Amino acid sequence: GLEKTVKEKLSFEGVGIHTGEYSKLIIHPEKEGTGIRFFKNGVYIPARHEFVVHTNHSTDLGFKGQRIKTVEHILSVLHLLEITNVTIEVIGNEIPILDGSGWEFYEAIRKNILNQNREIDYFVVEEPIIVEDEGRLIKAEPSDTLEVTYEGEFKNFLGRQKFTFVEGNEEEIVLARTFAFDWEIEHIKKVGLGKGGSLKNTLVLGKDKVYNPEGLRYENEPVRHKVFDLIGDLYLLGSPVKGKFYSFRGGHSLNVKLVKELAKKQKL
Numbered sequence: 001g002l003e004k005t006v007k008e009k010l011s012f013e014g015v016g017i018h019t020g021e022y023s024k025l026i027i028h029p030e031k032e033g034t035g036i037r038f039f040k041n042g043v044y045i046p047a048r049h050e051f052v053v054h055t056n057h058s059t060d061l062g063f064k065g066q067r068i069k070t071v072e073h074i075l076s077v078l079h080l081l082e083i084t085n086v087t088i089e090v091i092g093n094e095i096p097i098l099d100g101s102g103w104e105f106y107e108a109i110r111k112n113i114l115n116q117n118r119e120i121d122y123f124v125v126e127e128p129i130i131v132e133d134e135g136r137l138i139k140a141e142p143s144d145t146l147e148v149t150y151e152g153e154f155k156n157f158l159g160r161q162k163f164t165f166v167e168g169n170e171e172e173i174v175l176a177r178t179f180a181f182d183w184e185i186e187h188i189k190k191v192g193l194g195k196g197g198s199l200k201n202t203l204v205l206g207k208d209k210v211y212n213p214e215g216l217r218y219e220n221e222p223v224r225h226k227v228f229d230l231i232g233d234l235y236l237l238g239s240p241v242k243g244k245f246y247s248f249r250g251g252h253s254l255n256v257k258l259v260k261e262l263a264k265k266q267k268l
């Protein structure tokens with residue numbers, strides 16, 4: 001795989017699902033080996049784990065005081081488009097949630113991909129590893145390609161559901177919108193989060209009903225979105241990942257721990 005970047009600067013803007021505030025984005029190409037990094041207040045924040053500052057209802061990165069919330073979306077889009085050198089300038093405190101999915105980012109950056117002349121340093125899983133936490137469990141093991149699976153035990157008519165994402169099936173998860181349960185919203189709000197969550201940017205469900213009149217675009221949109229958010233957090237390794245992964249009720253917290261463990265036991 002050769003390093004990939006954008007042939008021209010692109011721009012994105014919209015309200016953040018948690019901040020409920022308007023935020024703008026400007027992606028400018030970079031030089032080979034530059035890497036994936038954000039640019040805020042004149043401070044470059046590389047897309048690495050060591051830059052993770054808060055992992056809750058979304059993966060956030062921050063440094064020197066600067067803070068960016070919900071970066072797993074854009075990061076996941078780059079993981080599927082295999083981009084390695086680009087600077088995402090962020091205007092605000094959270095990455096615009098757009099419609100709750102990554103279909104827009106994927107299509108816009110997809111129609112502007114530029115191949116470079118340098119092999120990418122894929123992070124390949126050389127040995128198996130597993131992390132656990134309150135029932136949450138994530139197992140990673142070597143694989144000839146990137147394969148992320150997610151299983152989840154829901155409390156509403158969703159019951160238990162699971163889906164496997166293999167290289168070349170992004171078009172089946174990028175359309176996965178974010179999702180929350182009516183009982184969870186109360187918490188997402190009391191904790192000062194989801195201030196921008198709406199039926200137009202979030203999949204609200206109940207004990208036995210789907211609040212969003214549009215219904216689910218798939219029979220497993222929820223777990224599919226978990227695979228999307230896990231694919232983004234998985235980029236926190238500093239380079240595209242190669243291997244297979246199975247997540248059970250995993251959450252952004254575990255996603256980061258797993259990566260941290262992988263980069264800690266793998267090193268360079």
Ligand SMILES: C[C@@H](O)[C@H](NC(=O)c1ccc(C#Cc2ccc(CN3CCOCC3)cc2)cc1)C(=O)NO
Nearest residue numbers: 057058072178179180185194197198199202204229
């Ligand atoms: C998948 C996860 O891991 C993570 N998603 C999130 O954290 C996440 C999901 C959903 C939301 C939301 C929301 C929301 C929707 C609608 C309303 C308006 N009404 C309020 C009361 O009546 C019904 C609706 C208010 C709020 C917020 C956050 C992720 O996708 N991360 O990438």
Ligand SMILES: [Zn+2]
Nearest residue numbers: 073178225229
């Ligand atoms: Zn998400």
